[PDB]
């Protein structure tokens, strides 16, 4: 079991033991890491524990090598020599190793608990192998935080689709949505056995936890629930494959008389051909996700994989391809588990079609000829590393905007992450500028662009529309109730219910609220399609009913508000909560 | 001498452990990277030969001008090579002769990616954006 | 050594073709094998180089199986 | 002919009474009625002729529907051999209760179930009769090329090898094969014709060959005395679908192996034998195939022949030099016992073209009847007949499985049974004695000046064509003549002969042209005289025997013969290896020690470019060990404490292998 | 010294007997597994018989023995013909029915050497070069 040191890529055999990911480390770097922090456990081809019959000494500064085993200070044979000596912990390839100085950064990456604001800015301006290691340890920390959630136990079964749950005392309740799957148990005497993978949702009336299940078992009183935790796969591929400006287009053959719609995008298509990876940045609704379909129709012999981190972003791409691209030579990939329903009009799960569509986590190991990664703001360096490990291709086009809302980063609570730290590509668009840029709002009415080009994008947007007189925003305080952690606001659903009998054309509008639970609970009063702001990024709607639930730091986030209000194609109703933001936009009063 | 015998037995077992661990590590490493090592070895050997036909077909295959079948040896047999861009056409073709693999070939027929036949007078510095690349040239050995 | 570098490059080149799963296409593997065995039993360097061109052109014929611009870059 | 008619005894008797009517010796159409192993050669030699007028579908096993606990099997209860006539099993159980391990082994080995439950096949790729096709799609098996060992090749051209006009050049490579190799190589059994042999002459050449095999001893041995060399060697078809031969030598306790072996002395077990394509370095691009014989045949043949076959390999000084090493002065001693006081020696060596495919069935039956003359006491007569029928059903004319399809092998030895180098040696001695008999009889007789030899020609004709009983006085006298003037040395088909030259010039002993004639009428191949050498000068030794040339060097204080290989072979074993991990070098220093042990005598060769091959291997072992300790000092920081590889690059460790002390 | 060397010899012997007991258990388990595999192989080959025609020919023999070589030739339901080139194909099984072993066979499939299905409209004198010979035509007894 030999490997490569993370921060100098020398050959080595050690692995730090207190770090969650066990990064391979060369000898000098391992001494630097175990002499400064408190990570004192090291594993070679065998661990560095004391091989006494009974002894617990693991601190590598203490152990000695004797015979063919490592003994502590009080069991060493007189033919022995210290490991942690001379500035080098002894491992294989000891004298062919190059020291480094980044051990003042690798310590901070491997030591921190990822809660402060600075750890993400350090996980994104380091070297590439440290970017991969930092992303991997962040994924591992987010996974082992899920073990800190409570444990459920059934009190009674009110109905076959209505359980009743009591949570463990002193441990926080998990949020109840289809992200978090639980496993059942009947552990009494008598069968400490999993009885199915379930998932919950808080039913409207009573303390009923309406559960969906894989199996068809009857649930007793004693059945109890434990959250599942997914092991983090280690990652290898670089975040950004190195750029190589070509002289002339390779692998792509352009087209004769593409269309009259994508005629103004031809120069950017030639630029995509010339480079290796290119980055596109535009304010919302300005042709970014349209540009990818135009890339499809400008290089018709080019096999393309479209990818995004959500499912509604890739579904917006799927709809645009349904409108434009030929539907026989297209596809769509859905994972087997699939707690959420996806777009089903393409020949699902046929990766050999010329135009594949996928979420970045569920990609299959394949090739392409140009791969389009839409919505890079919602991507972490784990996601870009996964898309660089699976998909091997000739050109990469990263499309997205940093001013929309990022990956959530559940651990981050103290501070704010500027756009140039969201991942590597968003840093590239905020360091040197994007390779391709298109700002002109071709989707939203000019009222929406007039109020959204003053909040984030400082007066840089003009619309190919006019004031469409269907942009209403009202100010109603909305006395809130509290769910698990995602608040629910009854009286604002009430005023929306009033705005549904008294405006008939709007019954096709889509509900948008920053909280998942209110998005579930306003379907049973209204019946409209419902979408959360975080998962609404990239798909537009004819009419949008937005409801600011609470006055907080989350729902009064201007990026979240911007991606909320720039999805209405022709009409929007915005039930606000904050006074200043309600004064910041310029709608009708209502 | 009893203790020195114990030391000799221990160092002999250490020596066998070193040898067996090295053999296992090197053998599994060699059997892992077998595809890439063989391809790198092949192209090292191909550059070492310095033949003027192998160099020509490799320097064409870098640009994108690869043959679609096995290159023939017989006089007056058929070879179909794809030419991706006009400049690659200009480097290899002249009039109707076609200089490939250090041999002269007589062009018979140039088709497009839409499988329409094309005359060699359409292939111009100016009309080429109106073509449908990559051409497939069917030629015969001189 | 010029004759006995083509006799060894045939061995390496047919090993590369066999690792690329040429031999699942029987009509192509018959011709690759015939070119290999004709190079190995050759006494004149000209005919060995013509058969080597024909054999290598099988490897260049398959587009994405190798990455010729990456392998030739290091030289 | 009726399709199901399998018993042609009356037709054979009508043919024999129409053509050979006044041939007075008895003819038993089924050889199971015969009286000794000289009435089996007689009646087998007749049935070789007659069985070419009978339909070819009526030979092979005779199935019969038996019942095991109520379920109906179809299993083989006999055989109908082209040479041996109809042979019926004696222990057939038409209603059996359960299947033990022995009965299960027998019913899975035999081809009656496999051919009876497969699709009919018509293979136009061959001419050999095709029985069935077990799979739904025939399998095309390729042979990959060998892996290049580029480090050694660059070391070799660094030392100045492989230049233009070199006397040492690569000719031994790893040749690859396309899909139709195994069935375009099995098709060489079309060279096997049904040859009737001259039976009044074969029944004398058998006695002289038996005199050549007189000093050894043999018999049946029990299953606990059987020595298997390597037990991880595959067990043929269908047993290779579940394990190696280790599994079937571990599952059957010695009672269950003795019971199977005592079963084959009263029953015939037909057997399927695979044809494996060989992957090894060679000089010519024809594919080479080896017949992997079923463990049900190899076990019993090992018990039957192992005592004789391990007493041939342990006798030094005989004609059959199998088991005499060329190291430690063994080659000198072999070459000195060839020259056992022949008068005016010339060495001679011949070459059977297609030795294992053209070899007739009668000479393979003679080889198996000479290897089974040692059982005068341990076996009865019918036991020896049923062992002959089991060899002819599992080895000679078996069902060959060639890529998912059962074909019928027409005849000639299969290179993988338990007695193949030795049965080949008996065939080789038989052809040399037949050449001498033809050369001595075909001489004039008035021109033979030596009054002893002319009387020997007269007595020889009389003992061939005028006696019916073996004349041990003259058989001993003619064998003494052959040893005095035609000394041989035999390794399975490589023969070196040290014949008297005045005699063979006068015509009293076989020259090359007599072997050309004998192989014409008794092998159906033409032996071209560009593969048979004649060395008139004994201080150069045999020009080639067992692929090693021989040279007379000065060693110690006296002159010895030493074997040296072909230098292209040793360099080809360096540069081209058949597994990817053998390319590494540093792991394989024993590979280069063995190659340098084989290439040591090239140092005493006078061509300097030959003598550099040994120093190339010594310098390569030194470089390999230097870079090995370099890497094993990097991986650790301590060199090996004890290291005795320092002697593999001194020439004394190698020269000690060719000095006669051990 | 006596007792300690006695116990060392004793525990060496006991570990040896344990190792040989492990070896015997492994051998007997593998014998059981091989006997199961042989029995299921024989019983599947029993179920694959064609018992009508097989009973007819076995009951038509005067002793009950028929040569093995004519068990398939008169009871097999599928005939696989392997054909090396086109003249052989034209002579043995031209068209969709043919004759062999005094029966009539109907061609149910033709695959090539690559296990790809080849339609009967392909096998012509001008498309004979582009087929991966030999052709395996599978026919059924009519
Ligand atoms: C005793 C011997 C060297 C002692 C010495 O001579 N020091 C002299 C000073 C020189 N310097 C540079 C080492 C300091 C040390 C050095 C390297 C050690 C091997 C590998 O690590 C690990 C490997 C796997 C298992 O863990 C146990 C077996 C293995 C083979 C080890 C055996 C033993 O443990 C070795 C040989
Ligand atoms: C006695 C005499 C020589 C001593 C032997 C040698 C060959 C023998 C003949 C054939 O064998 C068989 C033939 C068919 C019948 O069997 C009987 C008549 C026949 C004509 C025999 C007669 C007699 O018996 C012969 C001449
Ligand atoms: N070249 C164009 N001319 C006119 N309208 C366009 C053009 N390109 C895109 N649009 C419109 O603008 C909208 C932009 O959609 P999309 O590409 O999804 O924006 P985003 O990528 O910001 O979500 C599309 O609905 C499309 O109808
Ligand atoms: Mg978009
Ligand atoms: Zn650590
Ligand atoms: Zn390091
Ligand atoms: Zn201790
Ligand atoms: Zn007889
Ligand atoms: Zn016996």
From Swiss-Prot, chains B, E:
Subcellular location(s) of the protein: Host cytoplasm, Host perinuclear region; Host cytoplasm; Host endoplasmic reticulum
Subunit structure: Interacts with nsp7, nsp13 and nsp12 to form the replication-transcription complex (RTC): nsp12, nsp7, two subunits of nsp8, and up to two subunits of nsp13. Eight copies of nsp7 and eight copies of nsp8 assemble to form a heterohexadecamer dsRNA-encircling ring structure.
Domain of life: Viruses
Domain RdRp Nsp8 cofactor intervals: 1-142
Function: Plays a role in viral RNA synthesis. Forms a hexadecamer with nsp7 (8 subunits of each) that may participate in viral replication by acting as a primase. Alternatively, may synthesize substantially longer products than oligonucleotide primers. Interacts with ribosome signal recognition particle RNA (SRP). Together with NSP9, suppress protein integration into the cell membrane, thereby disrupting host immune defenses.
Organism: Severe acute respiratory syndrome coronavirus 2
Name listed for the protein in its UniProt record: Non-structural protein 8
Swiss-Prot record, chain D:
Effect of residue 594 to A: Reduces RdRp inhibition by remdesivir
Active site: 492-494
Cofactor dependence: Mg(2+)
UniProt region (RdRp Fingers N-ter), positions on chain: 100-314
Residue intervals of the RdRp catalytic domain: 345-507
Chain spans, region Interaction with RMP Remdesivir: 278-288
Domain Nsp12 RNA-dependent RNA polymerase span(s) in chain numbering: 98-662
Region span, RdRp Palm C-ter: 413-548
Binding site for Zn(2+) 9: 28, 34, 39, 43
Region (RdRp Thumb): 549-662
Ranges where the record places region RdRp Fingers C-ter: 354-412
Annotated Zn(2+) 10 binding sites: 220, 375, 378-379
Function: RNA-directed RNA polymerase that catalyzes the transcription of viral genomic and subgenomic RNAs. Acts in complex with nsp7 and nsp8 to transcribe both the minus and positive strands of genomic RNA. The kinase-like NiRAN domain of NSP12 attaches one or more nucleotides to the amino terminus of NSP9, forming a covalent RNA-protein intermediate that serves as transcription/replication primer.
Designated name of the protein: RNA-directed RNA polymerase nsp12
Species this chain originates from: Severe acute respiratory syndrome coronavirus 2
């Amino acid at each position: 079991a030999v490997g490569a040191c993370v921060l100098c890529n020398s050959q080595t055999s050690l692995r730090c033991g207190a770090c969650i990911r066990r990064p391979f480390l060369c000898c000098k770097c391992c001494y630097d890491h175990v002499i400064s922090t408190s990570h004192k456990l090291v594993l070679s081809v065998n661990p560095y524990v004391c091989n006494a019959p009974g002894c617990d000494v693991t601190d590598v500064t203490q152990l000695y090598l004797g015979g063919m085993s490592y003994y502590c200070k009080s069991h060493k044979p007189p033919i022995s020599f210290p490991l942690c000596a001379n500035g080098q912990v002894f491992g294989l390839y000891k004298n062919t190793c190059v020291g480094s100085d980044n051990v003042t950064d690798f310590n901070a990456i491997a030591t921190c608990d990822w809660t402060n604001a600075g750890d993400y800015i350090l996980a994104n301006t380091c070297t590439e192998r440290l970017k991969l290691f930092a992303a991997e340890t962040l994924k591992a920390t987010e996974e082992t935080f899920k073990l800190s959630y409570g444990i459920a136990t059934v009190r009674e079964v009110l109905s076959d689709r209505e359980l009743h749950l009591s949570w463990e005392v002193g441990k926080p309740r998990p949020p109840l949505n289809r992200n978090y799957v639980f496993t059942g148990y009947r552990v009494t005497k008598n069968s400490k056995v999993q009885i199915g993978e379930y998932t919950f949702e808080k039913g409207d009336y009573g303390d009923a936890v309406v559960y969906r299940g894989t199996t068809t078992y009857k649930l007793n009183v004693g059945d109890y629930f434990v959250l599942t935790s997914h092991t983090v796969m280690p990652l290898s591929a670089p975040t950004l494959v190195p750029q190589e400006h070509y002289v002339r287009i390779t692998g792509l053959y352009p087209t004769l008389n593409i269309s009259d719609e994508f005629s103004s995008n031809v120069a950017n298509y030639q630029k995509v051909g010339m480079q290796k990876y290119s980055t596109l940045q535009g304010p919302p609704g300005t042709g970014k996700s349209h540009f990818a379909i135009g890339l499809a129709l400008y290089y018709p012999s080019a096999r393309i994989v479209y990818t995004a981190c959500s499912h509604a972003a890739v579904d917006a791409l799927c709809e645009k391809a349904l409108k434009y691209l030929p539907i026989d030579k297209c596809s769509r990939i859905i994972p087997a588990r699939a707690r959420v329903e996806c777009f089903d009009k393409f020949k699902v799960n046929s990766t050999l079609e010329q135009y594949v569509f996928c979420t970045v986590n569920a990609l299959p190991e394949t090739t392409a000829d140009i791969v389009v990664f839409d919505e890079i703001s919602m991507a972490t360096n784990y996601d870009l590393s996964v898309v660089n490990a699976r998909l091997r291709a000739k050109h990469y086009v990263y499309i997205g905007d940093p001013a929309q809302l990022p990956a959530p980063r559940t651990l981050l609570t103290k501070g704010t992450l500027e756009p140039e730290y969201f991942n590597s590509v968003c840093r590239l668009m905020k360091t040197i500028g994007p390779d391709m840029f298109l700002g002109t709002c071709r989707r939203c009415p000019a009222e929406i662009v007039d109020t959204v080009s003053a909040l984030v994008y400082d007066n840089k947007l003009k619309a190919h529309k006019d004031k469409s007189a269907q942009c209403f925003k009202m100010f109603y305080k909305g006395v809130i109730t509290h769910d698990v952690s995602s608040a629910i606001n009854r009286p604002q659903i009430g005023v929306v219910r009033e705005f549904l009998t008294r405006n008939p054309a709007w019954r096709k509008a889509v509900f948008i609220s920053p909280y998942n639970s209110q998005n579930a609970v306003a379907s049973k009063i209204l019946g409209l399609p419902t979408q959360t702001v975080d998962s609404s990024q990239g798909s537009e709607y004819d009419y949008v009913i937005f409801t600011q639930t609470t006055e907080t730091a989350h729902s009064c986030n201007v990026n979240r508000f911007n991606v909320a209000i720039t999805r209405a194609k022709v009409g929007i109703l915005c039930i606000m909560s904050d006074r200043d933001l309600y004064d910041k936009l310029q709608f009708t009063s209502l | 001498d009893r203790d020195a015998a114990m030391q000799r037995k221990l160092e002999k077992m250490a020596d066998q452990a070193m040898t067996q661990m090295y053999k296992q590590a090197r053998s599994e490493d060699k059997r892992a990277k077998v595809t890439s090592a063989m391809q790198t070895m092949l192209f090292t050997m191909l550059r070492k030969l310095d033949n003027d036909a192998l160099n020509n077909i490799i320097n064409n295959a870098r640009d994108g001008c690869v043959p679609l079948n096995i290159i023939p040896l017989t006089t007056a047999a058929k070879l179909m090579v794809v030419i991706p861009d006009y400049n690659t056409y200009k480097n290899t073709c002249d009039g109707t002769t076609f200089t490939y693999a250090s041999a002269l070939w007589e062009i018979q027929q140039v088709v497009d990616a839409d499988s329409k036949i094309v005359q060699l007078s359409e292939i111009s510095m100016d009309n080429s954006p109106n073509l449908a690349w990559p051409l497939i040239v069917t030629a015969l050995r001189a | 050594s010029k004759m006995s570098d083509v006799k060894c490059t045939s061995v390496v080149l047919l090993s590369v073709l066999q690792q690329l799963r040429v031999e699942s296409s029987s009509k192509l593997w018959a011709q690759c094998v015939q070119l290999h065995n004709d190079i190995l039993l050759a006494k004149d360097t000209t005919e060995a180089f013509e058969k080597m061109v024909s054999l290598l052109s099988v490897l260049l014929s398959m587009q994405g199986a190798v990455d010729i611009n990456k392998l030739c870059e290091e030289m | 002919w009726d399709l199901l008619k399998y018993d042609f005894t009356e037709e054979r008797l009508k043919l024999f009474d129409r053509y050979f009517k006044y041939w007075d010796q008895t003819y038993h159409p089924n050889c199971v009625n015969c009286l000794d192993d000289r009435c089996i050669l007689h009646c087998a030699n007749f049935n070789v002729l007659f069985s070419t007028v009978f339909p070819p579908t009526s030979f092979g096993p005779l199935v019969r529907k038996i019942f095991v606990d109520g379920v109906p099997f179809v299993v083989s209860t006999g055989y109908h051999f082209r040479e041996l006539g109809v042979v019926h099993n004696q222990d057939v159980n038409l209603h059996s209760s359960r299947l033990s391990f022995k009965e299960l082994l027998v019913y899975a080995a035999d081809p009656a179930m496999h051919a009876a439950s497969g699709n009919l096949l018509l293979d136009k790729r061959t001419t050999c009769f095709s029985v069935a096709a077990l799979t739904n799609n025939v399998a095309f098996q390729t042979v990959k090329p060998g892996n290049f060992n580029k480090d050694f090749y660059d070391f070799a051209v660094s030392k100045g090898f492989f230049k233009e006009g070199s006397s040492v050049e690569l000719k031994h490579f790893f040749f690859a094969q396309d899909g139709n190799a195994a069935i375009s190589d099995y098709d060489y059994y079309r060279y096997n014709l049904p040859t009737m042999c001259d039976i009044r002459q074969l029944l004398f050449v058998v006695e002289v060959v038996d005199k050549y095999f007189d000093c050894y001893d043999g018999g049946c041995i029990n299953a606990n005395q059987v020595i298997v060399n390597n037990l991880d060697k595959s067990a043929g078809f269908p047993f290779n679908k579940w394990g190696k031969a280790r599994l079937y030598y571990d599952s059957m306790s010695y009672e269950d192996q003795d019971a199977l072996f005592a079963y084959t002395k009263r029953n015939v077990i037909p057997t399927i034998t695979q044809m494996n394509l060989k992957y090894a370095i060679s000089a010519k691009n024809r594919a080479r195939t080896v017949a992997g014989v079923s463990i049900c045949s190899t076990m019993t043949n090992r018990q039957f022949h192992q005592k004789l076959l391990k007493s041939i390999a342990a006798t030094r000084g005989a004609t059959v030099v199998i088991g005499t090493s060329k190291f430690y002065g063994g080659w000198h001693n072999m070459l000195k016992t060839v020259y056992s006081d022949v008068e005016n020696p010339h060495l001679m060596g011949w070459d059977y073209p297609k030795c294992d495919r053209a070899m007739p069935n009668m000479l393979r039956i003679m080889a198996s009847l000479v290897l089974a003359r040692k059982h005068t006491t341990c076996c009865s007569l019918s036991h020896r007949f049923y062992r002959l029928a089991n060899e002819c059903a599992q080895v000679l004319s078996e069902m060959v499985m060639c890529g998912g399809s059962l074909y019928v092998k027409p005849g000639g030895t299969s290179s993988g049974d338990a007695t193949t180098a030795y049965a080949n040696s008996v065939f080789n001695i038989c052809q040399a004695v037949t050449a001498n008999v033809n050369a001595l009889l075909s001489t004039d007789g008035n021109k033979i000046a030596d009054k002893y030899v002319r009387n020997l020609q007269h007595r020889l004709y009389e003992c061939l064509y005028r006696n019916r009983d073996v004349d041990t006085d003259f058989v001993n006298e003619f064998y003494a003549y052959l040893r005095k003037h035609f000394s041989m040395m035999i390794l399975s088909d490589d023969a070196v002969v040290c014949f008297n030259s005045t005699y063979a010039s006068q015509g009293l002993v076989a020259s090359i042209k007599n072997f050309k004639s004998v192989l014409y009428y008794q092998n159906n191949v033409f032996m071209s005289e560009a593969k048979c050498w004649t060395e008139t000068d004994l201080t150069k030794g045999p020009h080639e025997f067992c692929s090693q040339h021989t040279m007379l060097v000065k060693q110690g204080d006296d002159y010895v013969y030493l074997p040296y290989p072909d230098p292209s072979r040793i360099l080809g074993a360096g540069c081209f290896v058949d597994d990817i991990v053998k390319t590494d070098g540093t792991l394989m220093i024993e590979r280069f020690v063995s190659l340098a042990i084989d290439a040591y005598p090239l140092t005493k060769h006078p061509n300097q470019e030959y003598a550099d091959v040994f120093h190339l291997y010594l310098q390569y072992i030194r470089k390999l060990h230097d870079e090995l300790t370099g890497h094993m000092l990097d991986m650790y920081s301590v060199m090996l404490t004890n290291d005795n590889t320092s002697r593999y690059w001194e020439p004394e460790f190698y020269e000690a292998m060719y000095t006669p002390h051990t």
